[PDB]
Amino acid sequence: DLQSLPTRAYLDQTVVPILLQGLAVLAKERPPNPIEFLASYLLKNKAQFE
Amino acid sequence: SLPTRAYLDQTVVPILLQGLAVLAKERPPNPIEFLASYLLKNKAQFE
Amino acid sequence: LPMPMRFRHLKKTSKEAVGVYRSPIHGRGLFCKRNIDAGEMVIEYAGIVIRSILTDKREKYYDSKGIGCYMFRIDDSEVVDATMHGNAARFINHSCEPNCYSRVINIDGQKHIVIFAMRKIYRGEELTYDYKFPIEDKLPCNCGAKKCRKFLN
Amino acid sequence: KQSSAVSTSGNLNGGIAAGSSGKGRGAKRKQQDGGTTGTTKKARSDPLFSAQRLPPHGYPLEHPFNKDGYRYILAEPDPHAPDPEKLELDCWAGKPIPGDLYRACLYERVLLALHDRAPQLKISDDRLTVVGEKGYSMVRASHGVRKGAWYFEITVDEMPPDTAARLGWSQPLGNLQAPLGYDKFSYSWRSKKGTKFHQSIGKHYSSGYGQGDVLGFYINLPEDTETAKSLPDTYKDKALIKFKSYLYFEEKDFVDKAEKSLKQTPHSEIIFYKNGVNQGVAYKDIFEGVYFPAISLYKSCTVSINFGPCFKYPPKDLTYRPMSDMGWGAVVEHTLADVLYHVETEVDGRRSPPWEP
Ligand SMILES: Nc1ncnc2c1ncn2[C@@H]1O[C@H](CSCC[C@H](N)C(=O)O)[C@@H](O)[C@H]1O
Ligand SMILES: Nc1ncnc2c1ncn2[C@@H]1O[C@H](CSCC[C@H](N)C(=O)O)[C@@H](O)[C@H]1O
Ligand SMILES: [Zn+2]
Ligand SMILES: [Zn+2]
């Protein structure tokens, strides 16, 4: 079902909006550990869109 | 501080792109904790 | 000549240039009373200038009153509705071979729909233009032209 | 009326499905020097040339405002989404992501977007007031809310008796010629007596309005979870056009919704204030879809929208956000949208973190 979709479709049909918002907040806050700040942000907020 | 696009390109976009590759290739059941783990462990090569 | 000057001349001569009589096309229609040259201003379809969004509310209104809609689209934003207030241009029949043609002009910022003459029109001729009505699913035409589409739509 | 072939205007043709990935073949690659557009990295000058400002209200002369569900935005060249680094030993490692475009907005701050006004709508950037001449019309701001709670104001500078502005919110699908509440996707207030107008229906569940009212507007929509309960993906459309003398971008907007079932966004509401004093709740039932603050003009109405950092009677909430904050939030979001679309078309693969944010 979800794995049979093309690249554009599956990668769209799964995850786009969090990148949309998290990359935004990452550019807004300008943290010293950008990759690590994103990692902390996501490991805190894993669940509530899924 | 760089502009939005330039800052994100210099800070997160390449490791993001390699994660893009791996997610498009292996197609895990739970990509959520997949990128969790990936962005945690592969950060050292782009810090 | 200036479109304003030409328009003033047209509004001055309109009352004596054209008439309305019994028409072999259908009922009553616009006939030429003085030889009209090609491209010159025949008549304004004068009426109530309204915005497009208000058309339907008017139309349904007339649909509630059993009064026929006399509306011509100026453009995507304006319409001259002549149902309640208009001029003699409400009696111009259509022909598949028109000696006239509708054009929108801008005078002092306001748009006027003027029927001009596709050719040199002579006295007595009935005035007809291309309504360009979109194809519906059917109004038979009796314009008499050999090229007649048999239907406006 | 011809066939599934070349576009309706020979001025510029986008690559059809049979000509897939056909980039807009507009201006040729051979450019002139110009000088005015030869800005470098060392200079400090905003490339988005704002027009000359005039105290009397004016009209954007060569902007084809939205129509037929077709959104129209400013364009800038942006020859390279910046990814330049040193020459790596591996010549097949990085991707330039040459979108050759961006949604750069001709605005110093989050203001009333000129792209979404009617041709009968005049603006004065001395106060960014909006005015009209015949009947009603509608204008909207640059930003648009999708979640959270936020707040702005409208300042009224002129209200004769034959002058009645209306102020509120409206989702896309809102016909900017209608008086901000003629459809079910818009909820406003009539500035004669405080009267909530929606679906063209007037309701007196409201306070009274004053001629010199500096009115505050608070509005809280739930997170995109309770808004969609599903994927809020934002796959964007981008088309390049070269109008008479300037480059612009076209995108596909939403279609007229036949929604007749009531499914209010959970815990969403709208509150109205007169100079900060609570005029009360306006609409608790709020349909899904993004909303934006909007202003409707009657004959010669003078009103203006205003953000938070220069406020007069602001709420002291730590969660609500001014107009400017959500504005740059949405701007950065659409920047990332361009990033992701150029990624999709340019480099294989995509990947986003643990979904929740
Ligand atoms: N060429 C044509 N073929 C068929 N019907 C026509 C026609 N031209 C005009 N008509 C009919 O005539 C009507 C004109 S409305 C005018 C009514 C009537 N002729 C009168 O003078 O009082 C239209 O509703 C249309 O049905
Ligand atoms: N070719 C045609 N077929 C059917 N109706 C026509 C027609 N050309 C004009 N009409 C009529 O023209 C009207 C719109 S304009 C009215 C002009 C008409 N000569 C009149 O005397 O009133 C319609 O109601 C229609 O009935
Ligand atoms: Zn005919
Ligand atoms: Zn005919």
Swiss-Prot record, chain A:
Swiss-Prot/TrEMBL keywords: Acetylation, Chromatin regulator, Golgi apparatus, Isopeptide bond, Nucleus, Phosphoprotein, Transcription, Transcription regulation, Ubl conjugation
Subcellular location per the Swiss-Prot or TrEMBL entry: Nucleus; Golgi apparatus, trans-Golgi network
Main location (coarse class): nucleus
GO cellular component: Golgi apparatus; histone methyltransferase complex; MLL1 complex; MLL1/2 complex; MLL3/4 complex; nucleoplasm; nucleus; Set1C/COMPASS complex
GO BP, sorted A to Z: endosomal transport; transcription initiation-coupled chromatin remodeling
Residue ranges the record marks as coiled coil: none
GO MF annotations, alphabetized: identical protein binding; protein homodimerization activity
Subunit (UniProt): Homodimer. Core component of several methyltransferase-containing complexes including MLL1/MLL, MLL2/3 (also named ASCOM complex) and MLL4/WBP7. Each complex is at least composed of ASH2L, RBBP5, WDR5, DPY30, one or more specific histone methyltransferases (KMT2A/MLL1, KMT2D/MLL2, KMT2C/MLL3 and KMT2B/MLL4), and the facultative components MEN1, HCFC1, HCFC2, NCOA6, KDM6A, PAXIP1/PTIP, PAGR1 and alpha- and beta-tubulin. Interacts with ASH2L; the interaction is direct. Interacts with ARFGEF1.
Family stated for the protein in its record: Belongs to the dpy-30 family.
Protein name: Protein dpy-30 homolog
Organism: Homo sapiens (Human)
Residue window of the full protein shown: 47 to 96 of 99
Swiss-Prot record, chain B:
UniProt KW Nucleus keyword: yes
BP GO annotations: endosomal transport; transcription initiation-coupled chromatin remodeling
GO molecular function: identical protein binding; protein homodimerization activity
Recorded GO CC terms: Golgi apparatus; histone methyltransferase complex; MLL1 complex; MLL1/2 complex; MLL3/4 complex; nucleoplasm; nucleus; Set1C/COMPASS complex
Domain of life: Eukaryota
Keyword line: Acetylation, Chromatin regulator, Golgi apparatus, Isopeptide bond, Nucleus, Phosphoprotein, Transcription, Transcription regulation, Ubl conjugation
Annotated coiled-coil segments of the chain: none
Compartments it resides in: Nucleus; Golgi apparatus, trans-Golgi network
Quaternary structure and interacting proteins, as annotated: Homodimer. Core component of several methyltransferase-containing complexes including MLL1/MLL, MLL2/3 (also named ASCOM complex) and MLL4/WBP7. Each complex is at least composed of ASH2L, RBBP5, WDR5, DPY30, one or more specific histone methyltransferases (KMT2A/MLL1, KMT2D/MLL2, KMT2C/MLL3 and KMT2B/MLL4), and the facultative components MEN1, HCFC1, HCFC2, NCOA6, KDM6A, PAXIP1/PTIP, PAGR1 and alpha- and beta-tubulin. Interacts with ASH2L; the interaction is direct. Interacts with ARFGEF1.
Protein family according to the UniProt entry: Belongs to the dpy-30 family.
Record-given protein name: Protein dpy-30 homolog
Organism for this UniProt entry: Homo sapiens (Human)
UniProtKB/Swiss-Prot annotation, chain C:
Residues that coordinate or bind Zn(2+): 96, 141, 143, 148
Compartment(s) where it occurs, according to its Swiss-Prot or TrEMBL record: Nucleus
Residues of the SET domain: 16-132
Domain Post-SET: from-to ranges: 138-153
Effect of residue 45 to A: Impairs methyltransferase activity toward unmodified or monomethylated H3K4me
Residues annotated as binding S-adenosyl-L-methionine: 26, 28, 70, 93-94, 142
Record-given protein name: MLL cleavage product C180
Swiss-Prot record, chain D:
Domain of life of the native organism: Eukaryota
Keywords in alphabetical order: Acetylation, Chromatin regulator, DNA-binding, Metal-binding, Methylation, Nucleus, Phosphoprotein, Transcription, Transcription regulation, Zinc, Zinc-finger
Subcellular localization(s) per the UniProt record: Nucleus
Biased composition (Gly residues): 12-24
GO BP: any one term: response to estrogen
Disulfide bonds: none
Expression sites by tissue: Ubiquitously expressed. Predominantly expressed in adult heart and testis and fetal lung and liver, with barely detectable expression in adult lung, liver, kidney, prostate, and peripheral leukocytes.
UniProt keyword Amino-acid biosynthesis, yes or no: no
Region described as Interaction with RBBP5: 45-357
Region of interest: Disordered: 1-60
Domain B30.2/SPRY: 89-312
Variant or mutagenesis effect after changing residue 25 to K: Abolishes methylation
UniProt biased composition (Polar residues): 1-11
GO molecular function terms noted in the UniProt entry: beta-catenin binding; transcription cis-regulatory region binding; zinc ion binding
Keyword Nucleus: yes
Chief location bin: nucleus
Chain positions with Phosphoserine modification: 45
Residues bearing PTM Asymmetric dimethylarginine: 25
Modification after translation, per record: Both monomethylated and dimethylated on arginine residues in the C-terminus. Arg-25 is the major site. Methylation is not required for nuclear localization, nor for MLL complex integrity or maintenance of global histone H3K4me3 levels.
Entry GO CC: histone methyltransferase complex; MLL1 complex; MLL1/2 complex; MLL3/4 complex; nucleoplasm; nucleus; Set1C/COMPASS complex
Subunit annotation: Interacts with HCFC1. Core component of several methyltransferase-containing complexes including MLL1/MLL, MLL2/3 (also named ASCOM complex) and MLL4/WBP7.
Protein name: Set1/Ash2 histone methyltransferase complex subunit ASH2
Gene name as annotated: ASH2L
Full protein stretch here: 272 to 628 of 628
